[PDB]
Amino acid sequence: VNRCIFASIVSFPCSPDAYHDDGWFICNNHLIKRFKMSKMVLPIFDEDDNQFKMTIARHLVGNKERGIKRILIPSATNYQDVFNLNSMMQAEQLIFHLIYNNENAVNTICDNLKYTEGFTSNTQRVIHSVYATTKSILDTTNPNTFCSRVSRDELRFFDVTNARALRGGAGDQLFNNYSGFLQNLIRRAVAPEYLQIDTEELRFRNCATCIIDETGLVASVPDGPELYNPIQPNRLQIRNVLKFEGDTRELDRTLSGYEEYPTYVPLFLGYQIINSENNFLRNDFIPRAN
Amino acid sequence: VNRCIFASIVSFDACITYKSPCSPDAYHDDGWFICNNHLIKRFKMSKMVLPIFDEDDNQFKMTIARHLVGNKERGIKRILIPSATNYQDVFNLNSMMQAEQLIFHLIYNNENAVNTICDNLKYTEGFTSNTQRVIHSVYATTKSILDTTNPNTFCSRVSRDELRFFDVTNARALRGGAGDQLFNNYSGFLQNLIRRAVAPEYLQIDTEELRFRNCATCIIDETGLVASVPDGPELYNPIQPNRLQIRNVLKFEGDTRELDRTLSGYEEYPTYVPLFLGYQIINSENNFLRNDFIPRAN
Amino acid sequence: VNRCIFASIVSFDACITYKSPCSPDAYHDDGWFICNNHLIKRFKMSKMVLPIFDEDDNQFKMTIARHLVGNKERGIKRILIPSATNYQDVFNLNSMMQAEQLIFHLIYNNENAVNTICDNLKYTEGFTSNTQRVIHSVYATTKSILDTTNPNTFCSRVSRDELRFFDVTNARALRGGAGDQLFNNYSGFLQNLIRRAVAPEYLQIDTEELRFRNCATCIIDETGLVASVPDGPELYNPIQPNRLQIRNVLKFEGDTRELDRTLSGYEEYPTYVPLFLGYQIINSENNFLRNDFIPRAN
Amino acid sequence: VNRCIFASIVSFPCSPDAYHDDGWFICNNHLIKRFKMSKMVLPIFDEDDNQFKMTIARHLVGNKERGIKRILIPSATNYQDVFNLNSMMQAEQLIFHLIYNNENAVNTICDNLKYTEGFTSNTQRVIHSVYATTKSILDTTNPNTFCSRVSRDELRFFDVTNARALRGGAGDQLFNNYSGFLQNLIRRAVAPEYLQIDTEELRFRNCATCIIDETGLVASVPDGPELYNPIQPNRLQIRNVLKFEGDTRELDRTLSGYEEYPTYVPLFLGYQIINSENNFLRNDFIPRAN
Ligand SMILES: [Zn+2]
Ligand SMILES: [Zn+2]
Ligand SMILES: [Zn+2]
Ligand SMILES: [Zn+2]
After folding, report:
1. C124: contact with A, CB 8 A cutoff
2. If exposure means fewest CB atoms within 10 Å of the residue's CB, which of B37, C28, C126, D225 is most exposed?
């Protein structure tokens, strides 16, 4: 079973990791294509060799990109401007409008395709199949379902100012406006800076690599210049690549043996407070709301 | 496929291995979305087709329901499909299975009672492991049936070919009455159940006005779909192991053997009491004969 | 027979069959009324036997428990058998099974909580059949164990031959103390669990004092049976799937092979920390030699 | 299994119907011996052949009996005077003091037996077996048990003045002071004067034969003279016995064929409302509180 929200794209490409029950409910191909992230894992090791894996995503925005180009997951207000939904297929636009709980756009999409000659046969069935798959995925990721296995186990705050007091900041209250699928995506992509398992607090990164804003999940550092992240057949595009001119074969041969530390920029932000009584090690992917 | 709205009824928590007791007609895609057994048990009706012949031999058949309420029944016992306000009083949902209660609360779009049903089973230990799967399967099946029936879904394949008004005093002017506006308060599934159960007195096809019955055998009121005639006494309609209920039947004592043999060779006219009410105007551009069950709205 | 108070554990929902994780030693009629594994899980201890030899070889063996709490644990984690006031906070009864909640609410005589436990399950459909019997069986077994332990039973074998005090300030005068008055507040099962798990500092068979240990390893306080020493730092005591909990494991990095091989055939003094507290006066007309369990009230 | 309250009688006599699961929880032999009643079945016959059987008792007090001799099930206040518990076995006294919730008498019974030499050896095990059996039976018949299966489908009132409504009289109020076992005994013995299944009131008897007043359930007619009911070793009992001086042989010869209407005096009193939703045909023997 392809557990990808974008696996239902069909005229009116999923990586093999979509079939895995990772909990993202989106394939790495579609994550790269749409949300400018590639799924990774964060192996949290003991001082012994026992480990458990957490899912993180490395954003793929550049150093020079500014403005809406830095938004990873836009808010419901500005997701129209960020994504340019007109270019993508109408099924993709329906999926995106369902993801952001925009009912007016969904109704307009349904109304526009009602006037076509083929709507009655072999089209309405397809649109309803896409709608049903997207709605099932949303309900799986939505904690407000009829009988939802919501978890108060882990308290994931996206502001660390008052997080230790179990409170939240402005970014946390802006995070609640997101839908179930978007909240799950931000939880599975934006790793916590601190992981307060019971009393023990584990600081994974010194500073946050992303900030939740009114524009959405912004891949912008809180201060200073942005980090260096080096990354439609008929479309013409300009990349302005920062080419490195020089002979590096000798240097690469010299330093071959040593382990390579990745230059990726992962998403670390917020505070995670895992309660003493937890069921963290389950792979059923229950909604796990705050 | 078992397209029975009550086929999802299973024991929510107990592992009693309960099975849905509905006939093979559940598998048939007649547009009823309910069995004759389930209709008999709950809505006090039995599904029936109505052969509407031409003046030639060729025929097209319409669905109808034979209401089962007796002559002596009165008060809340006369209602077949209760309204959303008093469906709890009529049905006595407490005595039924929790799956049945959830299905009925979904049928009447009672979100508070559905949430209460979910909450009451949150405390049991089986909810985390097994009960949640069963409850969510029941919810998914019931919601799929409702959405297939509901004309206000995301992309609803609705048809305005026929204009079924349940008040005939002004339906000739293409305007319904108070009963029709009361009929709109019902959910989609109840609307389809009433349309498949209650047949019109007049089946107006283009200019033709085919009056099926003299007067109505059922009336839609704020109380619900009442199986009571508009005037006079009610029509004579002949009719849980641990329960002790009293029927007070009306039994003859005659021989009824030689008389039965005397006229047995002649075709018997059925004595059932089907539901007849409404004015189903049919447009000249109709698509009535198609059997894909397109949900219908007025 | 499996005379373990948690041997009656079972899933109330018949869909899941939960076997009791009960040690083989539970079937013994020692007088613990709790298995080794269950006392390891809750009331953190390991059931031990304390052989009190005579001056010659012949001996009588007593029962004592070793608290499994660590050196670093402080506050609530120190409590092994909590008081009836804060047993809900200490045990986190929400995460435990409903049978465990029932047993623990009966152990502390919290009638309101037990009534709540059956009130929550009274709503589900499965309560009437295959679950009422299960809950009643669990209640009957727990009540039988408690009544066997309860000295206030109808005709109980209450024995005053051995007096067990938990305050040693004035225990020689057969007088109790603050801890003993708190000990009387516990139910019968908790009193027997503490008596079988805690041994006196000063055994006083007849007029012969027998000081078991110099200083107490446990204290009975308002919080409950605390595994905290009277003064100074706590004693060094080395020590649920799908649950992620930190451990703070202390590890030894030495080779230890040569040192271990050096002392080959020398009897190993245990590092376990048993519960020693109180002053168990024994009367000249005692019947301690018996093997039939008795409540043993003051 | 011998589901009889007095089956556990043993020094410190049950009919075969005790083994039957009837809900009486007392055999006919012990009913006659103690409560001056005998078990009977009242077959409630439908107009067509479909019958359900209802339990009933026939009191065995005579025409001339008066005072405490007319009391079938005495109240908790005066059951000592009626039963003369001193003559009975100590096990019988313990059973009766448990049945009437007299904890002080039970404790005194335990205290009297404590001083005996053999109390600890074997006698206490016997007394605890008796106590356990009696208490299990009481809890089975007690609607106020821990979380037993109490049913309110049947509303049985012993005062028909206002029993047509949900209210009750003083006789029903005095009936609540009874213990669980005595309540079940009266429910299974005192058949209703009226049975109302789904607003269909069936009058089994014109006028009552017993009254639940103070001093317990009394086998006395509400008005007029008493009805005519004809009914330990080495004990001299002088009882007045009626006698018919006639031959009474040819008269019995002539009237042989016809069915006999028994001269039994059954117990009919009160109004039993039965709800439309009920499980009256079950055999699980729920306590059936009002
Ligand atoms: Zn995909
Ligand atoms: Zn069915
Ligand atoms: Zn055990
Ligand atoms: Zn008997």
Report:
1. no
2. D225
Nearest residue to B162 via CA among B148, B151, B146? B151
φ/ψ of B124, rounded to 5, equals: -70, 155
Tokens 């530390």 belong to A261
DSSP state of C267: P
Resolution (angstroms) stands at 3.1
Tell me the ligand closest to D28's alpha carbon: 4
A56 close to A42: Cβ distance less than 8 angstroms? yes
Residue C122 is given by DSSP the state T
Helix (H, G, I), strand (E, B) or coil at C256: coil
Closest residue by Cα to residue B14 from C15, C11, D147, C132:
C15
Longest CA–CA separation in chain A, Å: 67
C 131-190 → B contacts, CB under 8 A: 131
Q: How far apart, in Å, are the Cα atoms of A83 and each of A68, A98, A230, B74?
A: 9, 14, 22, 63
Residue for token digits 């929200």? A5
Residue C117 to residues A266, B5, C99, C122, D114, Cα–Cα distance (Å): 47, 34, 9, 9, 38
CB-based burial, D260-277: b 16+ in 10 Å, e otherwise? eeeeebbbbbbbbbbbee
Q: Give the three-state DSSP class for C86.
A: coil
Amino acid at C280: Q
CA A224 to mean position of chain CA atoms = 24
| Minimal C-alpha gap between B31 and chain D (Å) | 33
Of the candidates A113, A120, A147, which has its C-beta nearest B132's C-beta? A147
Distance A162 CA to ligand 4 centre (A): 73
* Chain C partners within 8 Å of D107 (Cβ): 154
Tokens at residue A245, please? 């001119």
CB contact under 8 A, B13 and C120: no
Distances (CA, A) of A218 to A96, A210, A271, D92: 18, 6, 17, 84
Whose tokens are 């669980």? That residue is: D180
Residue A21 near residue A5, CB atoms below 8 Å: no
Helix axes C132-149, C188-197, angle to 10 degrees: 60
Report strand pairing: B59-67 vs B45-53.
Answer: antiparallel
Are B200 and B298 contacting, i.e. CB atoms less than 8 angstroms apart? no
Nearest residue of A to residue B129 by CA position? A149
Instruction: Report which of D216, D194, D188, D186 is spatially closest to residue D56, judged by C-alpha positions.
Output: D188
For residue A200, the chain C residue with the least C-alpha distance is C246
